[PDB]
Amino acid sequence: FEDRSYPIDAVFMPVQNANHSIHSYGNGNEKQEILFIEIWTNGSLTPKEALHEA
């Protein structure tokens, strides 16, 4: 803190938003679930690339 450098309160979030939901299916006693994942990025990263890095 000197030389008159103004701080910038950056929020480091290349992923803007992320959500997951689950679908359940069944035929009798056999259960099976499916996972969905939604990803929003600010363009510095593709959603598929964010999935891999996570």
Binding site: Q16, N17, N19, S21, I22, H23, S24, Y25, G26, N27, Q32, I34, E38, W40
Partner: protein, 128 residues
């Protein structure tokens, strides 16, 4: 009013806003994170709810609207009996037809299916 210069092309004053509308900046924008919400609205059938309200704005009496829809639905079933009662419901077909008659576009009878079903025999199970 009418002006032609040299080569016969008419030249004219294009009309422009030439004035400030503060409603232009803050109203032609968009929210970016409603994909999940939009997909659930279609899943639960809320789109037809808005369509029904749209049709009722053009109707003077909502009771004659109900009777007319039922009369049109009865005609569908007599015309093609076997196509209704399962994935295609006659009353849903009437409503989507009447929205399309206004010039807007809707899927037939609001019928949609799950594309992620893991084959035959599997029922999607609802999380209460």
């Amino acid at each position: 009013g009418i002006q032609r210069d040299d080569n016969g092309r008419r030249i004219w004053r294009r009309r422009t806003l030439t004035k400030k509308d503060d409603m232009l900046r803050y109203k032609l924008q968009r929210v970016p994170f409603v994909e999940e919400q939009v997909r659930k609205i279609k899943e639960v059938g809320k789109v037809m709810t808005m369509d029904i309200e749209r049709l009722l704005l053009s109707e003077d009496n909502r009771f004659e609207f109900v009777n007319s829809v039922a009369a049109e639905a009865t005609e569908y079933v007599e015309k093609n009996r076997d196509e209704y009662g399962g994935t295609k419901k006659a009353i849903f077909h009437v409503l989507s037809n009447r929205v399309n008659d206004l010039g807007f576009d809707r899927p037939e009878a609001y019928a949609e299916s799950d594309p992620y079903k893991p084959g035959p025999g599997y029922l999607k199970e609802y999380y209460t």
